[PDB]
Design a protein around this ligand. Sequence first.
Ligand SMILES: O=C(O)c1ccccc1O
Ligand SMILES: O=C(O)c1ccccc1O
Ligand SMILES: O=C(O)c1ccccc1O
Ligand SMILES: O=C(O)c1ccccc1O
Ligand SMILES: [Zn+2]
Length: 258
Amino acid sequence: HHWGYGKHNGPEHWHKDFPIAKGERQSPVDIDTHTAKYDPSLKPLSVSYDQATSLRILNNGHAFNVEFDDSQDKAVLKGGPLDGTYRLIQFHFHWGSLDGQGSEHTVDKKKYAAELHLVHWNTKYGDFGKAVQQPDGLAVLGIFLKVGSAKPGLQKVVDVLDSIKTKGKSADFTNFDPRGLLPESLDYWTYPGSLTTPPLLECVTWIVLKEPISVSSEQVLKFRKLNFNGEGEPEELMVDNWRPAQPLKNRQIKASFK
Ligand SMILES: O=C(O)c1ccccc1O
Ligand SMILES: O=C(O)c1ccccc1O
Ligand SMILES: O=C(O)c1ccccc1O
Ligand SMILES: O=C(O)c1ccccc1O
Ligand SMILES: [Zn+2]
């Protein structure tokens, strides 16, 4: 599988190897804020990250993942639209070549400079690989990034990127606190969707926070120095690693707030 974000292997091509790309609950989507419905029965999100154990950071040739110990209930998401306990396995970002693009979800067609995805799996399915085969297997917390003031809690991530410049490189990344990436408010939109990269499985309850976080231009510039290619291969900057909005089809986006 040689999928990517280039002209010859990008999102418009993914359906040839992954036919679910044209399915009924693909992500991301545009969030029409005037069409989303407030649902008063939606509960507040419960983000319990105090015992989180980060292990490693990896450049996988499409983004970088910060990975966590998901062998115990150390960092979990529950409540909101979710039934059960969802364990944090990794987070990653999508970002642009310019500050006016980079997010996967859009809000009233507005694009943010980047988007953070905190990926969690439903513990009733035992492991991530089983969870991705279920319609309620994953819960992804999505957070928009806008360029402005620096985010202090992001800087530890930025400072390690030089050690994982190319595809396949990893580095130890212990004692990172993902709570430093969250905005003040946990108000959210939610809808059923999919992974946004191949295999594009329709297994995600998306929880997209309304409040973006601010990062500095210097922080996002360091993301843009990463490479899609392996060491010794022709340099292709890791930028614009986002899938565009897909048709909503027979879905409704719900809001936790009025
Ligand atoms: O593999 C990619 O994601 C890619 C992206 C941009 C340009 C060329 C590429 O191969
Ligand atoms: O110093 C950086 O911020 C950096 C980031 C990504 C890749 C190579 C780098 O030197
Ligand atoms: O978010 C995704 O698209 C994804 C895809 C494959 C594996 C883990 C993931 O989070
Ligand atoms: O291994 C290579 O082919 C190579 C090519 C360009 C620069 C550094 C390298 O190691
Ligand atoms: Zn993602």
